């Protein structure tokens, strides 16, 4: 292992912890009961990550080809990092900077990266939630606004944009977003999104006014309501038409898709984005426990609950998607039968699904001319399931379209969107703690101020920066920033974290500390996965990222209402300047880890 001279005399040496435990109680906060701690760690690890990213990350990679590597990596890459994070956060009695600034101080920069990432996701997340808030307010009216098209000035024909496409797509792209035609077309600020953004940030600031001791009172509801609303929705979904016909599309993998580096890279990124690893949240939330709190139990419990929750959410979402696909296929076939019977004037109840081809053949062989001039639609089941859903366009395009087809639609809509909003707050609690704690650790503010002013300043700054996603071109910026803000850092930070813990602090000190804490040295599985397999898998993922990044064109989708073949969104290439923004969103939070270190290698020379 690396030398790191002087690691001792900067760390408690297990002879004081039994007494230091009863010493920080006066100034450092502590949990009310273990239920609050476990429930907060659970709520931090579930929400708006397996409802939005997992669906189209399954779709774009063939549905079932994304679920095998995801589980292999959740077993071999997630659990040991959860355990490592909990253990060091509990043993070192420090936040997200302390546990890395106290191990070869030239690693302090790594901590900064975490903080910076916990900011780059903030601006992202509280935009999504804002949209949800909007969709939550537009309920409470029986003729739901996304159920029918509006009429133009001449109140006899529909608006052409809503006529050539669905009314839900119109309400999403024109009445809510008012999206433009390119990323180079920015417009007004669109007041009717500022209200929702301000409401989202005000609620978030209300819940985290004091960190722990105030979020620990809201978590009881916030991390519990989803597991009831989701069970209700699962029961409602598994009894539709396309259910058990759209679930199989999720569990029929194709062995030709597993050999692409893209799928494995996306699986790694998703298993690091599901568990909030390398975010600096858990390493700090676990730093409030007593020194004798069993750690394997909580790590294993959180991992299992999170994995099975992800599987249940995927099942529900693909149930609804299968229902939608079966509906559209039935529409195809009904329209084709209607055209056929309108052509030759056949009896109404004679042409059906079973004997369609026979009647088609007869009507051709009878009168070739009149039959040839007809127009047919060619469309089959298990082919509308492959309709790729764009980013952030699943929870608003398919679920509203399926909710508008059920009895008592307003109740279902209110329940669904309050569930999503609760998941959002459940995640933003930790995503805010991860920025609040390091800033206090940096002595940026004088101690004379209360914490309320610092939290308010952070919320105000992030709200003022979040204007960019309220322009006419908001969704494009959002997708651009999301394609890169959560892929490279959540790999590099995690790898540096595990390498630091194992091969700098020394794994033997770690084993002795675990023995002193819980009562036995970890099982052989933990050591075999710490010292051998996990660094190799993370290095392979890190390399595959660069293998798949270069040699593929960057393209994004646009709406273009004035473009022929309109119902399908178009693809175009990013302008040349945008490679600046990526370097500022994916380079700086990742390049800070070596950079700061270099500074020390020059400062202490």
């Amino acid at each position: 292992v690396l030398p790191n001279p002087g690691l001792d005399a900067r760390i408690p040496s297990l002879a004081e912890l039994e007494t230091i435990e009863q010493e920080e109680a006066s100034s450092r906060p502590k949990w009310d009961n273990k239920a609050q701690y476990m429930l907060t760690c659970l709520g931090f690890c579930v929400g708006l990550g397996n409802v939005w990213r997992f669906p189209y990350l399954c779709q774009s990679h063939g549905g079932g080809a994304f679920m095998i590597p995801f589980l292999i990596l959740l077993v071999l890459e997630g659990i040991p990092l959860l355990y490592l994070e909990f253990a060091i956060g509990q043993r070192l009695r420090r936040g997200s900077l302390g546990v890395w600034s106290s191990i070869h101080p030239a690693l302090k920069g790594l901590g900064l990266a975490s903080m910076l990432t916990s900011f780059m996701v903030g601006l992202y997340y509280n935009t999504i939630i804002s949209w949800i808030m909007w969709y939550l307010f537009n309920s409470f009216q029986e003729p739901l606004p996304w159920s029918d098209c509006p009429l133009n000035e001449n109140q006899t024909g529909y608006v052409d944009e809503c006529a050539r496409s669905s009314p839900v797509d119109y309400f999403w792209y024109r009445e809510t977003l008012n999206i433009s035609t390119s990323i180079s077309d920015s417009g007004s600020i669109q007041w009717w999104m500022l209200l929702c953004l301000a409401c989202a940030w005000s609620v978030l600031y209300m819940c985290t006014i004091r960190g722990i001791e105030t979020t620990g009172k809201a978590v009881y509801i916030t991390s519990t309501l989803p597991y009831v609303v989701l069970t209700i929705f699962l029961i409602r979904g598994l009894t539709l038409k396309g259910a058990t016909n759209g679930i199989v599309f999720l569990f029929t993998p194709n062995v030709t898709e597993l050999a692409q580096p893209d799928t494995w890279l996306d699986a790694g990124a998703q298993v690091f984005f599901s568990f909030s690893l390398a975010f600096g949240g858990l390493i700090s939330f676990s730093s409030y426990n007593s020194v004798h709190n069993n750690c394997e139990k909580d790590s294993v419990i959180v991992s299992i609950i999170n994995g099975f929750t992800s599987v249940y959410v995927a099942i529900v979402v693909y149930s609804v998607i299968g229902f939608r696909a079966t509906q559209r296929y039935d529409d195809c076939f009904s329209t084709n039968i209607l055209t056929l019977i309108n052509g030759f004037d056949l009896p109404e109840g004679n042409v059906t699904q079973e004997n369609f081809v026979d009647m088609q053949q007869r009507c051709n062989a009878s009168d070739p001319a009149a039959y040839a001039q007809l127009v047919f639609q060619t469309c089959d089941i298990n082919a509308f399931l492959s309709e790729a859903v764009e980013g952030t366009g699943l929870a608003f395009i398919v679920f509203t379209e399926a909710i508008t087809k059920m009895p008592l639609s307003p109740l279902w809509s209110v329940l669904f969107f309050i569930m999503l909003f609760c998941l959002g707050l459940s995640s933003m609690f930790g995503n805010m703690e991860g920025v609040v704690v390091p800033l206090q650790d940096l002595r940026v503010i004088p101690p004379k101020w209360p914490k309320e002013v610092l939290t308010g300043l952070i919320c105000l700054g992030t709200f003022l920066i979040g204007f960019i996603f309220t322009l006419n071109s908001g969704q494009y910026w959002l997708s651009l920033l999301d394609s890169y803000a959560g892929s490279i850092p959540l790999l590099i930070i995690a790898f540096c974290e595990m390498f630091s813990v194992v091969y700098v602090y020394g794994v033997d000190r770690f084993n002795k500390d675990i023995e002193f804490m819980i009562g036995h040295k970890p099982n052989i599985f933990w050591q075999v996965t710490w010292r051998v397999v996990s660094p190799l898998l993370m290095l392979i993922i890190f390399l595959f990222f660069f293998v798949v990044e270069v040699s593929q064109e960057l393209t994004y989708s646009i709406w273009d209402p004035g473009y022929e073949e309109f119902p399908k969104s178009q693809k175009i290439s990013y302008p040349n300047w945008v490679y600046v923004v990526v370097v500022i969103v994916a380079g700086v939070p990742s390049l800070t880890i070596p950079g700061y270190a270099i500074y020390k290698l020059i400062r202490n020379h």
Partner: peptide, 19 residues
Amino acid sequence: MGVIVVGIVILIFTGIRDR
């Protein structure tokens, strides 16, 4: 909006109180 700002003011004043 009203009720949530009410919660904000009550909480922050609850502070000065118990402070």
